Amino acid sequence: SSSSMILKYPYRVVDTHEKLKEAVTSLQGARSIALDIEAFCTTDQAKQLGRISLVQACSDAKPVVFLFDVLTLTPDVFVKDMQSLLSDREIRKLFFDCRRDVEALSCQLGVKPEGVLDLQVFFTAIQWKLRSVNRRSGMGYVLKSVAGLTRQEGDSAVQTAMTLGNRPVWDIRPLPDHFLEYAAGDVRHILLLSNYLVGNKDVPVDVVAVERLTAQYVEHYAVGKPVITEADATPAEVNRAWLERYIGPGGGCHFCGAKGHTEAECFKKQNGKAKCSFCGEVGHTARNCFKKHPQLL
């Protein structure tokens, strides 16, 4: 439905003060805003993101993806007109793994967003409530599991340069079209995921619970300085004590009792179903098969 139109939103480069005011007015009338950051690649390959180059934004108020050129605009100009927007708790800010992004917004821009919802944490919260799984999943896994969508391939020229790590990559101006298109991809996927995860009676976790859980991550990573102690035991998981407090106890399989999978995924329940040895059907045994014993039918 409306999820199909999200991925065909075109990008608008915002690199002037007039384009910045036109974008702020549009984002002001929004209810949710998907956010992402493209930063300079760091030779140290350390935790903290590099110098912010682009901030990507995609809201439900307009069919467009704003690419704020923070490098050209300078952080000071970009912050002066985006601060209250990011500080407005009445507008939901959507992220996929907000940790290093919130750290960069705090360290480099001096802003701490309000009303944040981390859709990667949202997915892990579902995995925790159903399977007692606290691992974090990548964007593609979440897109396939939640929306049944296989995202298109990222441009390998941009992907190799970023994995290579010799250069800032995102310092060049103007940016090629395949860099601009690469940068606008994540915010489209993020806003799409919110339609499947927010306002859904089939989602077993309340949004307010994941909002409270995300606010803890923001408080931990928006401290106006580089974060040293990570909130999670490993980078690819979610703090279990935070899951127990905000989401509740972890779940498991109602059939066999084991954690890590649900009843629909249980091998033992599937292997234990009666399978007719005479006609192959699942559901009955040979002693009750009408095909083998027509005296029953």
Ligand X SMILES: O=c1ccn([C@@H]2O[C@H](COP(=O)(O)O)[C@@H](O)[C@H]2O)c(=O)[nH]1
Judged by the rule CB under 5 A, the positions of this chain that interact with Zn ion are: 253, 255-256, 266, 276, 278-279, 289
Annotated binding residue 103: no
* Structure tokens that stand for 34 in this block: 């998907």
* Structure tokens that stand for 99 in this block: 């940790």
Q: Shortest gap between Cβ of 265 and ligand X (angstroms)?
A: 4
Closest CA to 198 of 36, 3, 64, 7: 3
Annotated binding residue 19: no
* Of the residues 75, 154, 252, 260, which one makes contact with ligand X according to CB under 6 A: 260
Closest CA to 177 of 16, 11, 35: 11
* Of the residues 61, 64, 215, 266, which one makes contact with ligand X according to CB under 6 A: 266
Q: Taking a C-beta distance cutoff of 8 angstroms, is the pair 104, 43 a contact?
A: no
Distance CA 288, CA 1 (A): 46
Q: Shortest gap between Cβ of 206 and ligand X (angstroms)?
A: 24
- Residues belonging to the chain: 297
**How many residues lie near ligand X (CB under 6 A)?**
6
Annotated binding residue 39: yes
Q: Does 79 bind ligand X (CB under 6 A)?
A: no
> Burial level of 6, CB count in 10 A (0-12/13-18/19+)?
buried
Which SS3 state, helix, strand or coil, does residue 150 take? coil
Q: Token match 């793994």: residue?
A: 97
178 vs 268, beta carbon nearer ligand X: 268
Q: Does 215 bind ligand X (CB under 6 A)?
A: no
Q: Does 103 bind Mn ion (CB under 5 A)?
A: no
Stretch that binds ligand X, among 47-55, 89-97, 227-235, 257-265 (CB under 6 A): 257-265
**Residue numbers at the binding site for Mn ion (CB under 5 A):** 36, 186
- Binding-site residues from annotation for CMP: 261, 265-268
Binding site feature residues for Ca(2+):
36, 38, 186
